[PDB]
Subunit: 386 residues, 4 copies
């Protein structure tokens, strides 16, 4: 009954179910989880794999001998369970040294340290089989206007990503990069604040084919943007390498609710789009079980992420298969939207008197779009009323 | 006393001072202005020029003989005053035929009509000397998820802009295009909702060098974004072709307040950036005198736009010239941000033990950034307390 | 099949289905509806009744003879259909004379005119059988700080409502007033911007028992507030006299989508609360069929409002009746929330060593709240997955 | 030069300058401050006094002997410096036991513990001379709809505040309560989310004269509301007992910037209102020096709070004293707003044919309000351009 299997490609960060509940105003409400026990419990729930920051897996400051022991234990749990590691990332935000950023810190020696910390984890990610390496520049930004010259900061950001691309190509690694945007928090404003800004920045890198985006549901909604629309533009550009699924109730702090919570209808249209477009990457959940919960509530919340995806997948598929919906899509001229405006070319358009001189503007204006009937059919399908 | 001259390149849309005050809940409070009298009054205030939609200058449905008479009267007022016309645009949003968009309307015949209406005004813009042609896709979007397949819509949007680029290059016109983003209103969500989304889309056009952005202060702030940061990314990409200046109080309907109203400190950092970066284009005001005002209040509001720019220009210049500010910029390491992270290259970085193995992470973390002293110096300069 | 009947008490404003589609950027897309034909069509759909502004029913400036004819035609349509008129209101926002407000306009003669226009429609409302008279102060507010002394404005607002209460009590009318809050639009900020501000203001009126609130879904969500929470506080205070149902996608212009659109889960919790608390007033829809629609889409949208309420009513009732949900409510201690904290009194609490000196704070902190399992049960019920 | 003195009544929470910089994504960047050294440094800066949570001053779990020692050291620093303690409050949010709230936790034993923890600190506050006791219900709320029955929660909230009022009156204490609203964070939605909701709730308490509000600049702006307008309604109701001053850049996480940062023009209108209305309470700063700063930046940020208040005070006073501004206020009819609408009474209004039958609605509509000239005079004064 809406039961996930590893074939559904559901993945979770170690930092999600492992979040101890420490927020800006309160201490942790849960003990720390051993990464090995997280891998085991997620495998029992039907997950496909896990993801990690370097500092989730190897405590900061560990010696190279303790580091090998932490990786050894982790790799044994992966072999014991069949879990994969499709993505990894770097923590360039927790340690106080990163208080003004990593790649765009004003201090040059911090920027060089940030790059070396990243490169070391790229080696580990490749060793564990990760295909995508995510960068979330959570500290790249400012609280005040004079603290950061943004043109210089973008130069430094481009320099850092170009160097990472030079590193992976010189090593022969088969891994790609995905930039994860966020508009604000913990900085007052964060550089590359939306999917669009990240897509535009990638086109100025030396090797743009190596970079895509890792959009997160809640982050685009923190700017009041339509997340399915932003995902469509990422897919249109061929840049949706990875995705972070969760829930968010509007414009406020980053809630990281379980997927399906927050904006339910946006979750429906998101799943409809991902499945229609044939997205084949991981369905990754970047969420936080609320700090009200004990460990039983943690695993219930994680199970809820996958359950809600599978319910929405079923409802979206029934919606698209419904002959009455297919009729309504034609009534609203979705078929005409897919046809070229002027495949006959510019000169034919200019000579076409039916396109302007003899166009009946009042008759075209009187045509209703029938969008409300279509949207109520979508509502009926979502609610199981049809 | 903070008096503008045409050398300041202040420009106004005919639709700004000519706004009659009709909002979603109320009738017009002011009579219509003759475009000729708007040109005269703006010239008296010290403006450099005006901009127009086709339908601002030539009433919709006019015959080709009435059309020549409207252009004739307008051109005579420009000659009488010395006013320029640096930018023009198309109205693809007022007439009911555009209720589902122009370039991305679901109906193909509307899309072809939208292109023909645009091409006709491009010819007129070139005749009047405009160097930039703006596109604001105010109706390109949706209120519901199934009404618009966004990948198909982006195909149609790219097709339309590619055809416009083919037209201007085949005619030999010396004009460039600027896309004006807006996140919402009048559609529930608008395609290309921010500067970033517009910049990313331009890189997929056939002739990207012909297209840039026309960002508007209030529109990026309707998504809660930092407008100076977005302008910096546009300048970094070489794409700031034009700009719309106004004011907005946060995330709500598009207010189009006079420039300097709304977020005053963002206006200060904006002017600082435009002047430091040597932006040489028009300082265009897309604002609406509130409908509480009579015609005396209209011209007072327009004068206020230019006055506030010139006051902020003076304060920003004093800020940057202050030796104590220059000292504080070095104390916050703005100078180090401008220097390459690794001009020595990747291999040198990997072999540099001071960048990781021997990096003193606690000593670097203890360095304060001194951002608050710098920001209070900026506040003191803005308020004239220094 | 989810078919409304007049017993469901669904009502619609004449201005809702009659909205012609004129928005800040576009002309009307639909012809005007005769109020008589709106009454007939809504009755066919299963509505209980209609509501009106004075100017919806009697065009502004009508003579007293044309006024009687408009009322006569309307009353005949009500008799022909069985439709009721449970609520009426005044248009104090469309005419330019109200550009700075009605009750709080700076000009005293406008304030007196606003009161006389209101009193005249109260007489008509009582004649048609209305039990609630709504006030939406859409023009009471400001775009700038010095334009309105808010303490003086609140004095004038209290003066106006006190005079209306003196009028209805001296006439012996059995009608009550409901204030409808909105945070902004069309003014930059509107006085009494939320349910809370309106509730607080009512307690300073001379006869507070005559006044309550008419909250609107989308308006509280324009401030990012939780609409079900605000309704609960209104019910707690005994002040929910009326309600406006619609949909809104977050913090932006007032969309007035059909009910069920926008925040679907908030609509579910709203219906759960209204039905559990025994709200017996009208279920009024203040919505706008999008201007993309023709008249067939108008009535489809109106039918969708009622359909979605009835589906959500069914899902909320199944949720509350589910024994497993009742078990989960006890697991989350909703039962303990309903019990007094200290029915034993202050002195008993102070002497109770188990409340502080001997309270085991670590054992209580370790109790999980089980909120996520409860919320997934609510999701399963909403989606019909259970 | 804009130098504060204790006569300016500037106060700071111990938790403000003492914030160690630990945010949801990062560790502390500053060592803990001894409360004694904070008192000394603030006195040197010109502060009037300090405020505290119980747990700021006495570490949680301290024995009654360590508790007396912490109070002794604190009282000696107050005597050494002349600093006052005008306000105190309870920490009912940091410890995990409060994860579902204090006064409205679902668990009854937690609610009783929360009351006992509060009462103990009220005794201490009275001993230190505090006149106001603040309650910020940061954990009172929910992330999901079924977790909290809000009517039951408001019953529990009223019960708790009624018991506190019974306690202070039975002890003969001369102290009043102030509720501090916040719309969200750390809970998904917080009960009593705005000034208005708090004002309305106070009117249902048994002894309403004992309770007022402690509004915070940034918190009302997290709902996109106009903070000066909300303060005016609090003053109108006679309920502004205390105020929290800081800065916030729009709708996002609670930034707690130094006062004057964020919305500068709202800070100007706030100071204008507080000084015009004769607010005599403490000017309290609830702010966080950004975690980018070292201890030198902490004290620079604190000094900036007071400096910006004094600059804005000077500019607001010059604005109101300017004869040209006084002329413009009369031109905009601010004088008429202060005069009663109908001091002649209801019957005189009904018989006044100039108020309706013979009112010239077109002549009144044509009057411009002259708000834009007034607002540019306010801008000129704020910027020192006049
Ligand atoms: Mg997030
Ligand atoms: Mg993420
Ligand atoms: Mg605008
Ligand atoms: Mg514009
Ligand atoms: Mg509305
Ligand atoms: Mg309404
Ligand atoms: Mg705060
Ligand atoms: Mg506070």
């Amino acid at each position: 009954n809406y039961q996930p299997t590893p074939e559904d490609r559901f993945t979770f960060g170690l930092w999600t179910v492992g979040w101890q509940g420490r927020d800006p105003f309160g201490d942790a409400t849960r003990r720390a989880l051993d990464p090995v026990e997280s891998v085991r419990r997620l495998a029992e729930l039907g997950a496909h794999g896990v993801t990690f920051h370097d500092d989730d897996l190897i405590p900061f400051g560990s010696s190279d001998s303790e580091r090998e022991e932490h990786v050894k234990r982790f790799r044994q749990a992966l072999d014991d369970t069949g879990m994969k590691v499709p993505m990894a990332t770097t923590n360039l935000f927790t340690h106080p040294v990163f208080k003004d950023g990593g790649f765009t810190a004003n201090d040059r020696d911090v920027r060089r340290y940030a790059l070396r910390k990243t490169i070391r984890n790229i080696d580990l990610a490749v060793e564990l089989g990760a295909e995508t390496y995510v960068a979330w520049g959570g500290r790249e930004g400012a609280e005040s206007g004079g603290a950061k010259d943004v043109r210089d900061a973008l130069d430094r950001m481009k320099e850092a990503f170009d160097l990472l691309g030079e590193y992976v190509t010189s090593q022969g690694y088969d891994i790609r990069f995905a930039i994860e945007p966020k508009p604000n928090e913990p900085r007052g404003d964060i550089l590359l604040p939306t999917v669009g800004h990240a897509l535009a920045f990638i086109e100025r890198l030396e090797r743009p084919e190596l970079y895509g985006v890792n959009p997160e549901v809640g982050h685009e909604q923190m700017a009041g943007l339509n997340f399915p629309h932003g995902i469509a533009q990422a897919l249109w550009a061929g840049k949706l390498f990875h995705i972070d699924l969760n829930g968010q109730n509007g414009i406020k702090y980053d809630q990281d609710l379980r997927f399906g919570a927050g904006d339910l209808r946006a979750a429906f249209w998101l799943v409809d789009l991902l499945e229609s477009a044939g997205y084949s990457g991981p369905r990754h959940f970047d969420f936080k079980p609320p700090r009200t919960e004990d460990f039983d509530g943690v695993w219930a919340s994680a199970a809820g992420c996958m359950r809600n995806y599978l319910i929405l997948k079923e409802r979206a598929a029934a919606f698209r298969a419904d002959p009455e919906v297919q009729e309504a899509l034609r009534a609203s001229r979705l078929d005409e939207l897919a046809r070229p405006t002027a495949a006959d070319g510019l000169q034919a358009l200019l000579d076409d008197r039916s396109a302007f001189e003899e166009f009946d503007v009042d008759a075209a204006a009187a045509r209703g779009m029938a969008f409300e009937r279509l949207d109520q059919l979508a509502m009926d399908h979502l609610l199981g009323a049809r």
